[PDB]
Design a protein around this ligand. Sequence first.
Ligand code: 1XC
Ligand code: 1XC
Lengths: 470, 470
Amino acid sequence: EFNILLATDSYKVTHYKQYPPNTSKVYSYFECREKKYEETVFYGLQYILNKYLKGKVVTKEKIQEAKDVYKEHFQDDVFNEKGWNYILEKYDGHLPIEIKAVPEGFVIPRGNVLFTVENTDPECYWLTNWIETILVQSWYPITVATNFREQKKILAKYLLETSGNLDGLEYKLHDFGYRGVSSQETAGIGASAHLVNFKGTDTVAGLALIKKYYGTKDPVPGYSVPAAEHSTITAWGKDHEKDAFEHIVTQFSSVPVSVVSDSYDIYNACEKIWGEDLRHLIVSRSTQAPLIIRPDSGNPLDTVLKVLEILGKKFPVTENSKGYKLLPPYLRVIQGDGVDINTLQEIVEGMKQKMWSIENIAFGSGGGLLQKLTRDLLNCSFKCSYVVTNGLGINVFKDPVADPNKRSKKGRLSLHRTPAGNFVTLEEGKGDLEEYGQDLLHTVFKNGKVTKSYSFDEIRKNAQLNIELE
Amino acid sequence: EFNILLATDSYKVTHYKQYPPNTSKVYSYFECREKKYEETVFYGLQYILNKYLKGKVVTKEKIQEAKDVYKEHFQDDVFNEKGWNYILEKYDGHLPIEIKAVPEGFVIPRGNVLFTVENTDPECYWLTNWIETILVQSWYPITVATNFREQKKILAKYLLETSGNLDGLEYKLHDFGYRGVSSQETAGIGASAHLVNFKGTDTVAGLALIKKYYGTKDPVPGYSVPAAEHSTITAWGKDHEKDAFEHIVTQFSSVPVSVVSDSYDIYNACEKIWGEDLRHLIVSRSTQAPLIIRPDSGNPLDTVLKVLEILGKKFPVTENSKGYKLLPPYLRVIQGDGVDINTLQEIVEGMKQKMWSIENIAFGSGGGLLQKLTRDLLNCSFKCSYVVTNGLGINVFKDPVADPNKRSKKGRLSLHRTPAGNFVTLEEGKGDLEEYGQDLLHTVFKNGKVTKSYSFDEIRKNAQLNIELE
Ligand SMILES: O=C(NCc1ccc(S(=O)(=O)c2cc(F)cc(F)c2)cc1)c1ccc2n(cc[n+]2[C@@H]2O[C@H](COP(=O)(O)O)[C@@H](O)[C@H]2O)c1
Ligand SMILES: O=C(NCc1ccc(S(=O)(=O)c2cc(F)cc(F)c2)cc1)c1ccc2n(cc[n+]2[C@@H]2O[C@H](COP(=O)(O)O)[C@@H](O)[C@H]2O)c1
């Protein structure tokens, strides 16, 4: 089981000794520093508050456990037993910390305060940055939620242009990333961030996380349909791919089914097997139960265009009111190999140039996508901006000579609406002047309690695209 | 709590219906496919076996939980209740699976079988690839362990060249990556993979994982020492950086201490503050308690060289028996900003060109490093190679026309020593001919039990460098 005393960077065990004497407040903040990704979706903090930070997180056994680990880890007695004892005794092991944050799902320009952290008891001045390590991991859900929102913008633009509406937009990017991320916990967190934007997922761990920590309007927040994998095709033997296809589509005759078609030869599969041998089993399917053919290899754009071209020559094609080609309603395509933000855009643009509607296609996003995301992408950063020492508030910051991009904000911070309705972060306590109306940060955690919560519904609403609102 | 019935990709829920009728065995394998990283360290499977796969992992409540989720997730009844019931009743919820694997810590060339998975009961033919998703996540510890071994090779080469020995090699790359990875679980797994190669870490989660799932020779598998962070320097106020430095080194006068020195001006900090104002507090320190100065911004190579140059002009420098410059034993440097496999090599080479011993420096590795690692780097791949249908064994594989790199191995597999002592993977059951001696894969899991285990000690020994052995 989890011990918060063992869930920090080792050096932070030694920091209580290092602050200026008689420091009664350490106040820190998180932002996605400025200097493509101009706005970020704030999401994921609530998961961390609930799983790791709330309630009685300190016990005598956890204190003794950490004392023993750190004695061996540092080969010395540096662990602050007294400090944690104080928390245990005075607060019944609840953390004397207050966290204020912008609402989950909010879409905020870079370079704004997203949350602040401070101690509520002068003796716990050291606790603020002890928990930096765990809080800074919010970089991941923020970054995943942001990246998928950007992909949703691309899909919305092209779907609107080629079809005239946004029908089905929320099912156009399906999460395939479960196996390609680094852990079960990461799979759940990342999938939950995908689901802020979309409704189709195979990462079941995301469903469980959302139900436990956020809650949903509907029984589940995401959906899937039956589909083959290479093993269920190749198990039939090379010469029996047709038999596998027939078996599978028949077993799933009345619901949508997707069938990977590139095990041996995608082009032969589409033209000869689906297009001729089994064509009678396709054209008889309901609109509510299409076959969704999946290529999974080759150049993504070339293979999609070539598959569309083949199907278009074997199946009746219509031209929609925008002038774009549309497969019959019982037949669609999904591309789930090598799809990232760059290649997604390349494919939909290539489709548009060849006069194919984006209605025809869906995409699957893999795990490598998310693995390539780093805390550096949006410059997710946690810094101390204010301390009280000897009863005097002091505005503090770093400003390394060889990197002005690493300069940090100074003093007490607050987040506001501008007269033009944008966001602004006020430094040095200037929010107190009340020239910019109400601080948009809410207290979400205080003294062991989660004081403000968001349902997954509120988060999805906050994260909507403008084009979705228009 | 964790439900294995909900820990797969959604589509795999539907696969039991898709295999050829009367299939009694599905046998699959994992490899780091061929086609820089020519050999990989096999590590991490044991964590997964113990945490997720062993014992009674199926219960009636878990079956009903999954049934309810999947009914809503698919908007249909597709979940295989009967199959999981069978496991619960016949095997007391233990998984009828056998996994055979190369020993943990083994260093193996690409394109070899690393583990195999098969069902042990004909009714559970579908269970083999149900668990693909969870097993394939072994890509992460394998890849992290491999990447850190490659960095260790670079450090060993340059430390030997510039000092004549490998003293301290195992403390030259310290894990700083806790905050920059995607979750607590990932932090633990990745840190454990780092610790296969090194002994210095700040990712405390790695200690806990190793103690629980592998076990160590010593009380803990990794160590750290006290150190500042920017907040403990900047909290003093801009004009009092000197006061912060003095306070910190005095508080830690008798143990090693590292102090980040770039809050405002790294070059002034080294030349004027450490080099003049506080120089008397440095030259008085024990060899067992050096000050380790940390730059953390600017071009990594340039800043390291400039810091060395400055310290060399303010402190007595010796020339070792190899002809390289060496700071006094109470003074060292650590660079923990932007260090990856490329930049590490650039820095040690640049140091070598300026005649500085690698004894002078240590490195910190960040989280972005590990985030940039993907399952694609070593081409980690899980494929079905053999099925038994109608009592007949059939060798199966995929071979997509537009990507011969995605071709898979055929038939029953085994791993062997070659006459020249290298590794070879035999396909199509050819291992049974016994022309290549004993299969190197061991049964590590069978029917709910972990049948062979490795201590962290055996893994570290297996993963040693050749130069360490020589
Ligand atoms: O089909 C799969 N699921 C079912 C499915 C069927 C149809 C649609 S749809 O047309 O959007 C649609 C949605 C809807 F809600 C309703 C509808 F009617 C239709 C969506 C989903 C399916 C397929 C593949 C798959 N996977 C999970 C991992 N994978 C593979 O695993 C690998 C991932 O590894 P990397 O991370 O390295 O990339 C890669 O091979 C990757 O293809 C899942
Ligand atoms: O000093 C730090 N720990 C103590 C320490 C002191 C000395 C040595 S040594 O000279 O090897 C040594 C080892 C030994 F065993 C014994 C000895 F005697 C000496 C090692 C370790 C320390 C410092 C910084 C630090 N951190 C943890 C995260 N961070 C920062 O957090 C950020 C990471 O974010 P990204 O993932 O995006 O990169 C980045 O700013 C990164 O610098 C930890």
